[PDB]
Design a binder for this molecule. Structure first.
Ligand SMILES: [Zn+2]
Lengths: 362, 219, 494, 363
C-alpha cells in the first residue's frame, strides 16, 4: 500500500519538553480532558536536526541530483514553454558544464520542484537574452539564486522527506515542497497532574540571605506520537525512484520516532527515555489511533500499561472496521498482545525496521 | 434524486482557515470550502501548479457540512479552541535570497474536539463522476489532513454513498444527527445565511473570495 | 483615469455575479443592486469609505425626506453630471499639477514596491515567511487609489519621519449597511444641515485638498481650520505614484487593466495638528484627568471580541464627570430611521510600529429599538465584561496568592489562557442574543445570559485550576480564590 | 557507542528533608500516577560544586553573584598584585556591562557565575588596550575569533563547562555563552511516598515546662534514582579542545560525586549521610535514562531497595535487547544480587568502576 503508519507510545520522566510563550507546558484538550502536548514542529525538528538524520539522510547516496543526467527529459517537459537553446543555456549556467556529452545515464523521470525552479531560471535567462544582458552580467545578478539551487541539488532526500528548509532559494509554486512524512502533535494518553518546581538562585557573596525566587512547570507522562509516510510522494520527489529505497528511508523514520526526543530543558530534567511501544502498519489511507485515548486513560499500575492495553484493545475492534487491512507489526517491551493476529510481534526494533524494509512481508 | 458522497472529518485537532496576512492564523467552527477543495485535491493528487484540474474540481463539486458534537459516557463534549505558540528558526527574510532571521513567531489556533460529517454532490456542469471521487478518497495519492499536515485522521474519509433529494435528507441516514448544517444548497423553511471568504480565487494564487453558507438548525 | 468619469469600481450583482468594473455614474443612477468584490475585506471597507467621502462631497441631502428618497430611488444621469461637474478635475490619478492624493516633486533615491501600500503583506518579519509573494507586483489604477486612501486613513505606516491622520493610528470605521452598495454609500452620507452642524464653517478654514493646496512643512494647523473636504481626503503621506506600465493581470485585484502601477516614491514630511478634528466615520472617547479633558478616537488595542466594543459604537454617553461619543454617521442614522434594525460594519487594524498584528472586519446586527433603550446594550456589554473580570481576578488570585495569612500562590499564568476560552465561548452567546432581542421587553434574556455566563465561569475556573489541585499547598489557596470568585459572581446578580 | 556517558545511581536515604518547598515542604513530583519525593537537579549540582571532593580533585568552583560592588573588592584582593585597579575595573565593567564606581552597591542583571581565571585572562587581554589603543568593540571583534582560547581558562571552572552559563548584559553575552555539557535529572523516589511530619516544640528555660503550640517539619525516607549524562565532545570543546582522557577523568569525578554527595539540607538535625547502593555507567551514542523502570512504582518486598535494583536490571535488559545497544556497560552494587547480563561487567568496588570509566569502557 501507499501509506505507512507509525504509532509510538513513549513514557517521559518529570520534565518540560515543550513550552509556550509564558514558559508553561504546551497542552491540548482531548475528550474534554487536558493533555500535555509536544508540538509536531518540535518533534520534526528534533528528528531533522538529529545526528542519525544527518548520517542516514544527510549523507544518503540519492542526495545529489545531477542535472547532466536530466538533459533529455527537461527538454521534453519544457519544450512547450521554452526553446532548447534557453534550456541548454540554463543547465550550462547551473552545472556549469556545457558539453553534451551524453552521460550514457539519461534519467527517465524528474523531481517536480527541480523542473519548477529551472523553469524559472529559463524564464529569467530568456528575458535576459531579450534585454539583453550578457552571460556574465546576468550571472552576477543571479549569484545568490544559483548558489541557492546548487545547495538544494545536493540535499535530495532531506527535501523529499522533510520538505524544503524554511530558507531555500525557492520561488515557484512547485518550489513549495511538502511531506513526505507527516508528524502529528504528541499528546498524553491521560489527564496530567502538573507539578510546579519552586527554585531559588543562591548568591555566593550574600548567603544570609535574600533568595532569588522562581517557578517552572513540569510533568511526567505517557505520550502517543503518530506519524505517516507517503511512499509515492517520496519516490516522486526522488524521481527516481524504486519503492525499496523509499522503504529504506521509512525505516530511518521509524527509528527516529522510536528514539528521538526534543532537547527542551533536558539539561536540567533529562527525559532521555526510549519508546516503550512502536507499531508500524501499511494502509491505503493514513489513520491515527488517537481515539484509543479519547477517553482519558486512568492509572492502574502506572499510566504505561493501561495505555498499551487501551491501544491494543482499540486496534482489535476498530482496525478491521476501518480500512486498515494489512500488513502490521508491533514492537513492545511488555505483554499483553493484541488478540488479533495479522500483526506480527517483533522482539527487537531492528527486526521491525527490517520488516518495514521488506515491504511488510514475512 | 441526486447521488451524494458522504465523508467524515475526525482528527483530535483541526484547523480551517480565515482571512489573514499576519502571524496569527485563526480558525472557524467548521471546515471551509477552500479546505475541503484542498482536501479532495490532495486525495486526487492535484499539484498546485496546474490551474486546470483545480478549476475543474472547484466548479465540479459542492459541499454540505454537519457539525458532530462528541458524546462519551453519555456526556456532551463541546468544541474548544487552542492557541499554539509556534516559532520558526532561520525563516525567510526575503523571497529571493538566502538571508534569514534568528527567530520569528506565529500563533496558530486549533480545534479540539471537533468531528464533522460532510456530504458532497456533483454540479450540473460536472467534469467528473462521483465514482472517481470515491475511489480517490478511498485510496489517496497525497497525504490528507484537516487542515494542517500536523492534524491527521482518526476515522477514514469515506463514510458512505447515498441517493437523496436534499443534502439534509442525505445526512440524516448517518448516525450523529442533530448537528447544525452549512450547505451550498437551500432547503425549505430555512432562512439564515453565513458569510465567509473561503472560495479560492484559482486564477490568482493565493487569495480568496466571499461566499455564503445556507444554515440549517436541527435538534 | 479619473475616479468620477471613468470605470474603476469593482462590483458583482447581489444574488449571483461575475465581477465588473463600474464608474461612479452607473453606480449612482442605476436600479440594479451591486455589491463590492475584492479578495480583501479591509480594501472593500477602504473602497466604501472612499465612496462615502466622495458621495458626501458631491451630494449632501437637503433634508431627511430627500435622503430617504435618494436611498430608495436613484438619480438621473443629468442630475449626477450636474453634481459632479465642479469636482471632476480633483480626482485624476495622473495629473500635471494636482494629482489624486499625490504630490508632484518628490525626491527619493530608490523606488518603493507597491507591497508597502498593501496592509499586512510586508509589514513584519514573519510576513515574508507566511505570506504569498508578488501581490504588490502590479496593481490597477482603482485598487491603487483604494490602497492610497486606505494607507492615508486606516493603515498605521510608515513610522519614522511619516505621520498618520487625521484621526490617528488604526482608527476604527463604523458604516451603516444597506441592501445595496449605492444605498450603503448614501446611508453614510451626512445631510447638509448636520454636515454644517458638525463642521462649523466659521472660519479661516482652507477647504482645498492636500494635493490642490499643499501642506506647509512643520506647520501648526488648528483642527477647526480644516475644511470638511480637506479633512476627509487628508493625506500626510507625501508620496507620488511612479509612471504606469502596460496591460496585464493585477496582482491583488486578479482582473485585467489597461494601466498598472509598479512602484511609488515617498519622502519624510512632518507637521503637527492642534486639537481634534471631528471625523464622521469613527467614534471617539472622552476621558477626564482630572482636571484636563482628553478626547481620542477609538482604536483596537487588544485581541478581545468585537462585542466588547459594541457599547462604544452605538451608545452615546454624555455623563462627563467619562463619557464617549458615537460616530456622526450612526448618530444621524438613528435620527433618520428610528424604526429600523441596524446592520453596522466596522473595521480596523492592531498596530505595532507600521506592522499589523491583527485585522478585524465585523458586521454587527442590532434589532429594532437600538436607538432607544441604549442602556440595555450597555448593560449586556458590562455584564459580559463583568463576568470576564470575575474569572480573571479569581485565577490571578490563585496565581499570586494571599500574603497576609501566608497563602502560597501557584506561580503559573492560567488567567490568560482561560480568558481566551471564555471569549471563544462568549462570541457564540452575546452577539447572537444581542442581534435578536426585543429591547423593550427582554431583561429575562439578560437573566438567562447571566446564568449561562455564570456556569461558564464556574466550569472554566475548575478546568483551569484542575491540574494544580492535587497539592495541599495550592488547595488552600484555591479555596480562597474560589471564594473570591463566588464573591464576584454573587455581585453580578441584580 | 562512545560519545555519551550515562550514570545511573540508586541510593537509599534514611528519614530526612533533603530539599524543601516554599512552604518548607518536601519537594515532590508525580510519576506513574504516584507521588515521589524529589530532589532538585540544581540542588545536586550546587551540592557537587560546593563539595570538598570537588575542591580536592577538580578545583575551585565558580562564584555566582549579582553584587559587582563586592566582586570588585574580591577581584582587587585576588588580582591586585598582578594588575592595576583601573584595568580590573574596566575588565569587570566590560564583562558585566555595568560600571565600577567605587560605590557601595551596584548590581548586575542576574546571578552570574564568575571564574577568577578567565577574568585574569581578560585583564591580560584588556592590557592590550594599554598598548596601541583598540576600540572596545574592536577588541571584542578580536576576541570573537578565538573562543577556544577563552575556554581554556574554563579548566578553573569546569562546573560551568559541565552546567553551562548564560549572559544577558556586557561582553559576556557574546563571549561567555557556554552550552553543555552535563545533563542531570531530578532525583525522584522509585516508589510511592507518604511523607511523615515531625511535631516539635521549643522548651523555654525561663517559662517551660509549660504549654505551647507545636511546629511541623515534613520528612521522609526513600530510595532515590539519580541520573546524569555527559557529552564528552562538548566537554572537550568547553575546556578549549582538551583531550578525551581528561574529560573521562572529570567524568569519573562526576560519577563519584553522584554516588556519594548528598545535599546538606536538614542534615544537622536528620543526618541522612547514606552512600549509593548501586552505580551503573554505560557508554552510548545517545543519552538513555532508566526512569521508566520505576514508572510502575516499586512495591516493598524486603524494603524498597532490592526491588528497585531488580526492576532497574530487568528494564535495562528489556531496553538493551529491544534497541540492540552494545556497551561499554558496568554495574557496581553493594548488595548480593542476581544481576545480568554479559557484558554489563560487575565491579566489586566503586574505584574499579571509576577505573573502568577512565579506560573508556574497555577495562
Ligand atoms: Zn487590480
Amino acid at each position: 500500500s501507499n501509506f505507512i503508519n507509525i504509532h509510538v507510545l513513549i513514557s517521559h520522566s518529570p520534565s518540560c519538553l515543550n513550552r509556550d510563550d509564558m514558559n508553561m507546558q504546551k497542552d491540548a484538550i482531548f475528550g474534554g480532558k487536558r493533555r500535555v502536548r509536544i508540538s509536531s514542529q518540535s518533534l520534526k525538528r528534533a528528528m531533522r536536526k538529529s545526528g542519525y538524520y544527518a548520517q542516514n539522510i544527510g549523507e544518503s547516496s540519492l542526495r545529489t541530483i545531477h542535472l547532466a543526467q536530466l538533459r533529455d527529459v527537461l527538454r521534453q517537459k519544457l519544450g512547450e514553454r521554452f526553446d532548447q537553446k534557453i534550456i541548454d543555456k540554463t543547465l550550462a549556467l547551473l552545472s556549469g558544464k556545457s558539453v553534451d556529452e551524453a552521460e550514457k545515464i539519461s534519467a527517465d523521470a524528474v523531481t517536480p520542484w527541480v523542473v519548477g525552479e529551472i523553469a524559472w531560471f529559463c524564464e529569467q535567462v530568456a528575458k535576459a537574452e531579450a534585454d539583453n544582458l550578457d552571460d556574465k552580467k546576468l550571472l552576477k545578478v543571479l549569484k545568490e539564486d544559483i548558489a541557492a539551487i546548487r545547495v538544494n541539488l545536493q540535499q535530495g532526500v532531506d527535501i523529499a522527506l522533510s520538505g524544503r528548509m524554511a530558507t531555500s532559494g525557492m520561488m515557484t509554486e512547485l518550489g513549495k515542497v511538502d511531506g513526505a512524512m507527516s508528524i502529528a502533535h504528541a499528546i498524553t494518553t491521560h489527564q496530567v497532574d502538573s507539578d510546579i518546581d519552586w527554585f531559588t538562585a543562591v548568591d555566593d557573596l550574600q548567603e544570609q540571605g535574600s533568595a532569588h525566587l522562581g517557578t517552572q512547570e513540569f510533568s511526567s507522562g505517557v505520550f502517543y506520537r503518530y506519524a505517516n509516510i507517503n511512499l509515492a510522494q517520496l519516490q516522486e520527489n526522488l524521481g527516481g525512484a524504486s519503492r525499496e529505497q523509499a522503504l529504506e528511508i521509512a525505516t530511518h523514520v521509524v527509528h527516529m520516532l522510536a528514539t528521538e526526543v526534543p532537547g527542551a530543558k533536558q539539561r536540567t530534567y533529562a527525559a532521555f527515555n526510549p519508546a516503550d511501544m512502536v507499531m508500524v502498519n501499511f494502509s491505503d489511507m493514513p489513520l491515527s489511533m488517537a481515539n484509543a485515548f479519547e477517553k482519558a486513560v486512568k492509572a492502574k499500575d502506572g499510566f504505561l500499561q493501561p495505555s498499551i492495553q487501551a491501544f491494543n484493545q482499540y486496534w482489535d475492534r476498530v482496525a478491521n472496521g476501518y480500512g486498515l487491512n494489512g500488513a502490521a507489526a508491533q514492537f513492545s517491551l511488555s505483554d499483553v498482545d493484541p488478540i488479533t493476529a495479522q500483526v506480527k510481534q517483533m522482539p527487537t526494533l531492528e527486526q521491525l525496521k527490517s520488516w518495514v524494509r521488506n515491504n511488510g512481508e514475512a | 434524486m441526486r447521488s451524494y458522497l458522504i465523508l467524515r472529518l475526525a482528527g483530535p485537532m483541526q484547523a480551517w482557515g480565515q482571512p489573514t496576512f499576519e502571524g496569527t492564523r485563526p480558525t472557524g467552527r467548521f471546515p471551509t470550502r477552500s479546505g475541503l477543495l484542498g482536501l479532495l485535491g490532495a486525495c486526487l493528487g492535484i499539484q498546485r501548479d496546474d490551474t486546470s484540474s483545480l478549476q475543474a474540481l472547484s466548479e465540479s463539486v459542492q459541499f454540505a457540512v454537519r457539525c458532530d458534537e462528541l458524546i462519551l459516557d453519555d456526556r456532551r463534549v463541546s468544541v474548544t479552541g487552542l492557541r499554539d505558540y509556534h516559532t520558526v528558526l532561520g525563516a525567510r527574510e526575503d523571497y529571493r535570497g538566502l538571508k534569514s532571521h534568528e527567530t520569528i513567531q506565529t500563533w496558530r489556533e486549533y480545534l479540539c474536539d471537533a468531528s464533522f460529517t460532510v456530504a458532497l454532490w456533483l454540479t450540473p456542469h460536472a467534469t467528473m463522476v462521483i465514482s472517481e471521487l470515491e475511489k480517490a478518497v478511498l485510496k489517496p495519492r497525497y497525504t490528507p489532513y484537516l487542515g494542517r499536515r500536523s492534524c491527521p485522521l482518526t476515522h477514514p474519509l469515506f463514510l458512505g454513498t447515498c441517493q437523496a433529494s436534499d443534502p439534509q435528507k442525505a445526512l440524516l441516514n448517518y448516525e450523529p444527527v442533530g448537528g447544525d448544517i452549512y450547505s451550498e444548497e437551500s432547503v425549505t423553511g430555512h432562512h439564515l445565511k453565513f458569510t465567509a471568504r473561503d472560495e479560492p480565487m484559482i486564477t490568482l494564487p493565493r487569495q480568496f473570495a466571499s461566499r455564503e453558507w445556507y444554515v440549517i438548525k436541527g435538534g | 483615469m479619473n475616479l468620477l468619469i471613468d470605470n474603476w469600481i469593482p462590483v458583482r450583482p447581489r444574488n449571483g455575479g461575475k465581477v465588473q468594473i463600474i464608474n461612479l455614474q452607473s453606480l449612482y443612477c442605476s436600479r440594479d443592486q451591486w455589491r463590492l468584490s475584492l479578495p480583501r475585506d479591509d480594501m472593500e471597507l477602504a473602497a466604501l469609505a472612499l465612496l462615502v467621502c466622495i458621495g458626501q462631497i458631491i451630494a449632501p441631502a437637503k433634508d431627511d425626506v430627500e435622503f430617504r428618497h435618494r436611498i430608495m430611488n436613484p438619480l438621473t444621469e443629468d442630475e449626477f453630471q450636474q453634481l459632479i461637474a465642479p469636482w471632476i478635475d480633483m480626482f485624476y490619478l495622473n495629473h500635471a499639477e494636482h494629482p489624486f492624493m499625490q504630490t508632484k516633486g518628490v525626491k527619493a533615491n530608490d523606488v518603493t514596491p507597491m507591497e508597502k501600500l498593501l496592509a499586512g503583506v510586508s509589514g513584519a518579519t514573519n510576513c515574508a515567511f507566511v505570506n504569498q509573494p508578488g501581490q504588490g507586483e502590479a496593481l490597477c489604477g482603482g485598487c491603487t487609489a483604494i490602497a492610497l486612501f486606505n494607507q492615508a486613513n486606516q493603515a498605521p505606516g510608515f513610522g519614522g519621519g511619516f505621520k498618520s491622520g487625521l484621526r490617528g493610528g488604526t482608527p476604527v470605521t463604523t458604516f451603516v449597511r444597506g441592501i445595496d452598495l449605492r444605498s450603503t454609500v448614501l446611508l453614510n452620507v451626512l445631510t447638509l444641515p448636520r454636515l454644517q452642524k458638525q463642521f462649523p464653517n466659521e472660519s479661516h478654514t482652507e477647504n482645498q485638498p492636500t494635493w490642490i493646496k499643499p501642506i506647509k512643512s512643520n506647520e501648526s494647523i488648528p483642527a477647526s481650520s480644516i475644511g470638511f473636504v480637506r479633512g476627509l481626503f487628508w493625506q500626510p503621506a507625501h508620496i507620488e505614484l511612479c509612471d504606469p506600465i502596460g496591460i496585464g493581470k493585477c496582482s491583488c485585484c486578479g482582473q485585467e487593466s489597461n494601466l498598472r502601477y509598479t512602484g511609488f516614491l515617498k519622502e519624510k514630511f512632518t507637521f503637527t495638528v492642534n486639537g481634534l478634528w471631528p471625523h464622521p466615520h469613527s467614534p471617539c472617547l472622552v476621558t477626564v484627568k482630572k482636571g484636563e479633558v482628553e478626547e481620542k478616537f477609538l482604536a483596537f488595542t487588544t485581541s478581545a471580541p468585537s462585542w466588547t466594543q459594541i457599547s462604544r459604537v452605538v451608545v452615546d454617553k454624555i455623563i462627563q464627570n467619562n463619557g464617549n461619543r458615537v460616530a456622526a454617521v450612526v448618530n444621524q442614522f438613528r435620527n433618520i430611521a428610528p424604526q429600523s434594525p441596524l446592520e453596522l460594519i466596522m473595521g480596523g487594524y492592531r498596530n505595532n510600529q507600521a506592522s499589523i498584528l491583527e485585522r478585524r472586519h465585523d458586521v454587527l446586527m442590532f434589532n429594532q429599538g437600538w436607538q432607544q433603550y441604549g442602556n440595555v446594550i450597555n448593560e449586556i456589554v458590562t455584564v459580559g465584561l463583568g463576568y470576564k473580570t470575575a474569572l480573571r481576578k479569581a485565577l490571578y488570585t490563585f496565581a499570586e496568592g494571599f500574603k497576609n495569612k501566608d497563602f502560597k500562590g501557584a506561580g503559573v499564568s492560567v488567567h490568560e489562557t482561560a480568558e481566551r476560552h471564555f471569549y471563544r465561548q462568549s462570541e457564540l452567546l452575546i452577539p447572537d442574543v444581542l442581534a435578536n432581542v426585543n429591547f423593550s421587553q427582554a431583561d429575562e434574556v439578560i437573566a438567562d445570559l447571566r446564568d449561562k455566563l455564570h456556569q461558564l465561569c464556574e466550569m472554566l475556573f475548575n478546568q483551569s485550576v484542575a491540574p494544580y489541585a492535587h497539592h495541599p499547598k495550592l488547595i488552600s489557596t484555591l479555596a480562597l480564590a474560589r471564594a473570591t470568585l463566588y464573591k464576584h459572581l454573587r455581585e453580578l446578580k441584580p
